[PDB]
Amino acid sequence: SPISPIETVPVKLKPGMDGPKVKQWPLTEEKIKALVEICTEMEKEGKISKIGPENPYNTPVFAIKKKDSTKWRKLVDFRELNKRTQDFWEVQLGIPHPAGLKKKKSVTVLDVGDAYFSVPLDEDFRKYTAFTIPSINNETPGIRYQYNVLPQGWKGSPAIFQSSMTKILEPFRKQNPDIVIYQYMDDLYVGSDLEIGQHRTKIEELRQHLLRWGLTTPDKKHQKEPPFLWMGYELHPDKWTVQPIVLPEKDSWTVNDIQKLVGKLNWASQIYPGIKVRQLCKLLRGTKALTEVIPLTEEAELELAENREILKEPVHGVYYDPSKDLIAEIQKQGQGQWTYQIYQEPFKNLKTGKYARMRGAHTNDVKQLTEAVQKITTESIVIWGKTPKFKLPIQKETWETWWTEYWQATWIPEWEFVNTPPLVKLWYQLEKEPIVGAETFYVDGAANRETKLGKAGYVTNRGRQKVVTLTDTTNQKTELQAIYLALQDSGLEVNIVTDSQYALGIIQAQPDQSESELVNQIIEQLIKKEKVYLAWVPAHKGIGGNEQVDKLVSAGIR
Amino acid sequence: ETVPVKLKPGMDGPKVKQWPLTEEKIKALVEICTEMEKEGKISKIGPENPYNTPVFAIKKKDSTKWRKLVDFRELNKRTQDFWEVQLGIPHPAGLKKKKSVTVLDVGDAYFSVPLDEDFRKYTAFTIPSINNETPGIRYQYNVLPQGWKGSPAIFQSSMTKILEPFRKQNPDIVIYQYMDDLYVGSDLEIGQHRTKIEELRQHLLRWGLTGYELHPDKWTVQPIVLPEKDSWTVNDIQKLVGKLNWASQIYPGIKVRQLCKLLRGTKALTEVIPLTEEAELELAENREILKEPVHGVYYDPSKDLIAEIQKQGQGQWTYQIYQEPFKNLKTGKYARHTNDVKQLTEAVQKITTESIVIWGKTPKFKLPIQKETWETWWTEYWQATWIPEWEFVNTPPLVKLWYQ
Ligand SMILES: N#Cc1cc(Cl)cc(Oc2cc(OCc3n[nH]c4ccccc34)ccc2Cl)c1
Description:
The complex is a heterodimer of chains A (558) and B (404).
Chain A: H1 29-44, E1 48-50, E2 61-64, E3 73-76, H2 79-82, E4 106-111, E5 131-133, E6 143-147, H3 157-174, E7 180-184, E8 187-192, H4 196-211, E9 233-235, E10 240-242, E11 253-254, H5 255-268, H6 278-283, E12 293-294, H7 298-311, E13 327-334, E14 337-345, E15 348-355, E16 362-363, H8 365-384, E17 389-392, H9 396-405, E18 415-417, E19 439-447, E20 454-460, E21 465-470, H10 475-488, E22 493-498, H11 501-508, E23 513-514, H12 517-528, E24 531-536, H13 544-554
Parallel strand pairs in A: 13-17, 17-18, 19-22, 22-24
Antiparallel strand pairs in A: 1-6, 2-3, 4-8, 5-6, 7-8, 9-10, 11-12, 13-14, 14-15, 16-23, 19-20, 20-21
Chain B: H1 23-38, E1 42-44, E2 55-58, E3 67-70, H2 73-77, H3 80-83, E4 100-105, E5 125-127, E6 137-141, H4 151-169, E7 174-178, E8 181-186, H5 190-205, E9 212-214, E10 232-233, H6 234-247, H7 257-261, E11 272-273, H8 277-290, E12 306-313, E13 316-324, E14 327-335, H9 340-358, E15 364-367, H10 371-377, E16 389-392, H11 399-402
Parallel strand pairs in B: 12-15, 15-16
Antiparallel strand pairs in B: 1-6, 2-3, 4-8, 4-9, 5-6, 7-8, 10-11, 12-13, 13-14
Helix pairs in contact in B: 4-5
The complex binds ligand M22.
């Protein structure tokens, strides 16, 4: 195979470090033989060169057989050389998403054959790649060799090959602006809008140009045909989709079966709208062993089923027309679960997906909706280089109200409300002013760091008063408990003064769901009310009713 | 003949990730680097260069032309010994006192000066492709890069020469150089000021180099403001003693006892209460107290500056600059087709530029936003040639009001 005439990438070892010098284990006669056969051939083809014992470096060599077959493969353990080799630039920092591919008249995939071996290695670095084929036991000094090409398993090969292929293509890319070439690993994906003629021809001017540079590629008849089964996808000429998803019918599900399941599902989620995975996921929580069978929860039984239906029948995605806009639609599936679809032309999706994440311990749909919009915005820039227009299940009035009053800067790009229940709303609002003729509850809560014992209570201006003991709490827990009491013993309207910025902050944010059951009951109470006012005062400041509940709940506690 | 740059020992080049860019900004950037390459300012690079600094495309202030903005925040940190304790540019306390200060871009002065061959790698950056069609276009500088704090450190000598005549002839004009910009202060009539600036631009013009009016001296207070009123409520007192309480610790000698005893027993919030005059003595002493500086708070050059920003509402934002929590060096308010991000961006730059003028150093921002939101959007409104450091926080429910 040709060995590219191209320039060399100067490679250097890591500062203050020297090349490797690892001792060779002695191998059996059958192995020393194989390596001698393999090595001479490599040397013949210019891939490796024979050297002396003046080269102090060394990597261990090994030879494996053939699972089923009877051929020998030589394995070079470049661990120590890799640990001494300089760091390179990150090859590709992402991979093309089908939905970002533009429709092209004709596309031919071109895999370079023997990629690494078709490209040279910095003359002055070749020395560190020295290895030895041990002699029959101890006698006779080994047969030393070194690389002239990019070795397999070495830190810099993927990086240097890519660079070379980039440099080797630049020329062609100038005299062919209308031609698209996708560089992925050691593949080339070519697409143009010319008729088959100038195409099957241009591809040839390509393969050839590739060859003057030591790079061989498959010729027609050997070139693959659509649908391309690339990276878990199916690349048809007019659509795309994930490769066939097979949901394993089972009797008992082990941790490892659910895990694989969740993954097939998530992958499927890129084009099959409505894929849910929270119930299946909850099982994995704390998980026993890999082989430990887990009984399918009934919600999980119900999720898996809904999923099976979605998967029944095939769904496909379309490609990207750069002239049309991008429309992103979001929907609330429930339990902090969102699902979105991206299309240019109404209902012909380029791609789908889902958002779950619990950002914070207490959140609401408004906060979640805008977190998903941002996650989608980023996604779009990545794939299409531009952000979509949104259609959200949130009333423009709700959005305004919330954004306006929230302490934090929030900003949704261009959007439009779409009536697709469930609709996003706020389950309650805290009054800005104190409710006249409404019982003022002065709440409070304490907890002993030593005994972990707590006390939560309140004193109203209406004469009422209460105190409750808690067994394994914290101040935070007692202070929230205190507000819960006030909300319980108070009726449709109240004013509540606390000295808990913590509780304040939590509630002032209009949370509609929390990891805390307490916070959940409070929410439930806040939604019941007709009007609630909640204020804060400093603690241990002789503030009226305040100093009163303190003594009440401080008794015994502290 | 280049000056040599050495990274701060036991630490190496920046390997910062590159944010996804929009097609529009990517093309704008390709055109730019294509020209820079020609002019020989930058050079394409090989995989054997593991470094990276993010690069963005901005539009500037009222400009139709795209401009390149390299985020050398990391490279800056890793070179702090060079540009700070070795080749530093002294900051003049005179600046903040001038009636008028004008800001000029000077970043073009650097492309005429070459960068130490051995430092070049550290200036690597990438122009990303879309949907990862291809490998990004890797580049590295051959000349002093704009945005890098080592640039004005090096150019210092040449700048000193370029300005000698002008300075000699206007001993009452202060010219400070912070990164890509030139700060020129004077107490002249606006017209004589504007005139000297144009005169200063000409000198600049004879060496290649090719304003925006600030008025520092008119940069005043923003004391914690206590309400004046007729007929008080339990609530208002509560709010008052809470705001006054928090005003303490930072403010020396704030009294609340009087106001407190009026709140005795457990009364309704709506209930109205007559203010005992001594209480007014407190409001008086506090109000008077609040209307002054702090006392005991001084700027320490060896300390980072910090800036907190609070979204108040209706296009208003408050902010404080300090080094030690509650020891405010300065506080103020920025007031606004503007959205939350646009507005917040505008505050960040406003505050920063003042910091550059007052202390000749930028604060580290604590932004009341989502790291993700801010990150995707901030560039649509950035106009500065620099970027301050920033972390994200969740504003404290009270602090926002105590500062309104
Ligand atoms: N393997 C692989 C493989 C993997 C990748 Cl990432 C890309 C690729 O080539 C393309 C696909 C395109 O998108 C869809 C398309 N347009 N025309 C087609 C004809 C047949 C099949 C798909 C298409 C458009 C252009 C090209 Cl360069 C092939």
